[PDB]
What does this fold into?
Amino acid sequence: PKDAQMMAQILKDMGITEYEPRVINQMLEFAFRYVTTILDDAKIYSSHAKKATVDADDVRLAIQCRADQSFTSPPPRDFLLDIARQRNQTPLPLIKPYSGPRLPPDRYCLTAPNYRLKSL
Amino acid sequence: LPSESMKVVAESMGIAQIQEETCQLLTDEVSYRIKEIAQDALKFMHMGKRQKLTTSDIDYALKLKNVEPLYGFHAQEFIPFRFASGGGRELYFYEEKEVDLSDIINTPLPRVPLDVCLKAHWLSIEGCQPAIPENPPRLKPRSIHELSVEQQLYYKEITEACVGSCEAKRAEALQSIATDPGLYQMLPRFSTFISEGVRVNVVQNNLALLIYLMRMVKALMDNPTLYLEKYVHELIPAVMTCIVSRQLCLRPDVDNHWALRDFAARLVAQICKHFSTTTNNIQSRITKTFTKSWVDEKTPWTTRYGSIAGLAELGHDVIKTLILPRLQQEGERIRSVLDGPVLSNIDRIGADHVQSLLLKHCAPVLAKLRPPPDNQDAYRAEFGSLGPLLCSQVVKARAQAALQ
Amino acid sequence: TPLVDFLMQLEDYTPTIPDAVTGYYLNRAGFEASDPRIIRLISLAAQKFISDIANDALQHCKMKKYTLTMEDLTPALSEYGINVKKPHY
Amino acid sequence: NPADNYHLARRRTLQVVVSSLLTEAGFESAEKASVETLTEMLQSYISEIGRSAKSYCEHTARTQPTLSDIVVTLVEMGFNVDTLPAYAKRSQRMVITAPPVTNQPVTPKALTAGQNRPHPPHIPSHFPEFPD
Amino acid sequence: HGDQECYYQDDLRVLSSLTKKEHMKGNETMLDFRTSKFVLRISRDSYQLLKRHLQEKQNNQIWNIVQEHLYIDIFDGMPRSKQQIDAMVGSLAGEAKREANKSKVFFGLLKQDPNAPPQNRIPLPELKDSDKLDKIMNMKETTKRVRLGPDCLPSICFYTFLNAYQGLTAVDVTDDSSLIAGGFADSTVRVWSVTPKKLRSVKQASDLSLIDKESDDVLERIMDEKTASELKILYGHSGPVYGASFSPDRNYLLSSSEDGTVRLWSLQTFTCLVGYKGHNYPVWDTQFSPYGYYFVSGGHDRVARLWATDHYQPLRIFAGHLADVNCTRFHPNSNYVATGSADRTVRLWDVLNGNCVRIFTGHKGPIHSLTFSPNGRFLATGATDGRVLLWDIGHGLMVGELKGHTDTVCSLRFSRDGEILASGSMDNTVRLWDAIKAFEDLTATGHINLPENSQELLLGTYMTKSTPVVHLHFTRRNLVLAAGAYS
It folds into this structure.
């Protein structure tokens, strides 16, 4: 196919030699899902600005307002190094040490009487 | 991705009159997201140690990028289908795009495979890799035999078990021949033992000695490790050393067991024709022998039978072409045995066996190329050998086909 | 309590989905088969969801029966808030 | 191939289930893409009560889910649980058979019995024996 | 991009995708590469030619980029060869400073050992009489332990997973070869007993309450015989289980998975006890301490946490890597944690103060295996380039390099004596290396001019039948165990 032969070149440019045949079919299903939610939001933003033609600033708005919610990332390095030095210098107070099966407090564990219904 | 696919999608949605720069803007955004996910699905493939990139890797790569591995449907409310995947859609390019709703119900479900178990074996014994099936595999000096003394003892035990004094001993020895991986480099001595045995074992027609050797040949053939077509030259005569050949023993009784041995020999011959096959050497050579065994005047009747069986078990087309112009000769031979005058030789037994085998083959061929109309007296145009009983055999075959 | 009285009547009543298949997709998510009547309620709750969509897509097919299409699933799931996608490939 | 039969024994059982649920007061001869759509929503629905009722019980420090964890799981998927006792008592209700087992023989191997060699003292007795 | 080194090829294709600013604003690896400084260890004989080409105002802008984005760490010595520079480069923020590798590291074993805490010698938190009973039968195994060397090559017993159509992602074996755990892609952990002794759970609380005082009733009367299998399946992860780690007292299985939790499974009740939720991201590895109280887990969020099985929150966060913490290994004295990672660096972390005390660079791919020498003086690391690099810990110079493997080296272990390092990769081979002739020789320059000793250090290759060697284990009688999941 046309758009499925370009998908095998995006993977081969990323060095992915071996892949399942259902891998191309669902990256095209995601790429179709992503463009019909940019352009769906683009004409919502065009009707907000009251213009009959969806031009390039509408797609510039609909991309950066969908990338602000959908595609997140891990926390940044200046945030990870601040919570590290707050934790690595904090003395982590105390709890109940010697308890044979050593464990957190019982509201943080998964050890409850764990009931079930009577069969009748 | 091509832009001429993105305009087709846009105009099939209600968004008409899109510019080329608008359309090129779509195909570099979505081609990045395919490249971003396939690079991210390769992380799950490398952490799976499978180097495969299965269909589930993209389901976790999508969930990692906070996109629903929802395929083919997108829920704007997100609650019935969260980031759990539905396994994709089993769709094809060459599909029918319309099925009947009772075709999917009536098909049998595939077998759930075996659960995961833990078996242990040995990769290395003090540095050396064993050849178990869980592993990939001036005076001149006094030379040594190329077999070890375990190998000669093994060979001696397997050959003394394969002459069938005890049946459980035979059966293990036959399974040992059928799956020993290191049975190459002992195979000349096994082929020579078979070949030499049949030739000095037809001097006196010792049926068991022969039935055990034919089972040894069958156990040699289905072993997947060893390379056999270097030894098939000596083996073809040895396995066939008593197929058509007469019996120096009591021919009339054990004529049942030797006929069964002949059937086994036919089956091994058909397996040989299916394999070891190159152009015009093996199958055509045994076919030519069998036919000049058939077209022989005053033919040995224990032999009018072995060669008939050999020709019969050669497959679909061979009886479709070789068992057609000869019915009259078969009938004349049967009529002569019936006339008599006296039973000097087991001629009558040979005739009955040959006629029964030929009649069964003729039914199956007839059932195969023609409708089952006029099954009463039309076979009288073919000398009336099997007639209505042949028609009944064809009907039984049709019933088996209906059951299938 | 009707739903407790309902689940106590499920030692019989094999549902439309087998418990070897409903229990397979429950074991995939950590739900283990403690009580087999618990599986049959989840198999019944998943039947009723699919049956309510096929019964509402039939009303969108009578206005335009005898074939379920993607243009019948599209307005049927739109009141559910689910935008179904055409493969278009 | 028994490798893809691990998945296709249970997904083609869900195809018979949707084909049996679209026949009950309904269709014959459905479109092919409409069946693999609906059996993908069925697998994603069983896998979502699997992940969410396990999450609701483990939030309450338990390991196996009761009835009260699923009637809150189905509420959070918008199910209206009270209509389920009426759905279970249909006269059109059908049962789809479970898939067949690959190891039908179970124990068909005569095996090859060969013993030679012992164990050096750095190998305990519970490891497999040294081969022939 | 064409005139770059061949071992940077996977690094440039992430840069070819980066063309926009907002594409790079959410990458967080090139965001930390842009703010850090490349260290670039150069000699003073070559730096004089560089600074005589940059201090002049004819160039005057590439010199401004160098003194803004690049550190330069100068050593007084010979300029290194090209096949020696190739051995110690390949990491972003590569070839770290010698001032990082000069801290005092207590790389000795506990109980003299001057390079190790002289008197504390924590012999396992509250070493119990049942834990002292374990070491009594451990030294009976040491009596039958063979000296391996380059002559008495060990026997390898491969424990293959035959069907395994759910993908096996994690293996661990106990210290005595008695249990084998399997982490699988169908979100299960499966414990197998390999000794002829079935896996039993302890009795329920009603059965233990009736057990009379004394009359033995200690460690056999509580084991339930109604529950006795050769296989126990553990459910509860909502994702593929990537780490698996036994505790040294043969209870307390650990498992980490894609769902971001580390789970502590009991091996007396065969249930889950705790779920440690500190990562929101796939935890790629976990390991118990060799004394069994603390454990370290490294995840996709580019940190490694130190837990203690008593707190729902970690104690130490090791947060200096720029990519995923792929591996997390404890030192044999458990005062130091080595964390290999996907940014081609291996880092030792002190458990006190959470400080990085060593940075080992020189791998070309993400590190997928670490192991320590039983001396505590050395560290073997393997990565996707098929290279096993042997590092010193008191010095930090990676003295040796083993380059026999082809694909990703996913399992390393030294012998119980330290005589042989065993390496298992995706080439389906178990290579054995001479781990005595590799460290025989062992500064002021930061390198030792390591030779091509790989051919001499090979003792065997041992090709496996279509089976990637996921785990390597050494029995206490010096017998190699390996587990693979036959494909």
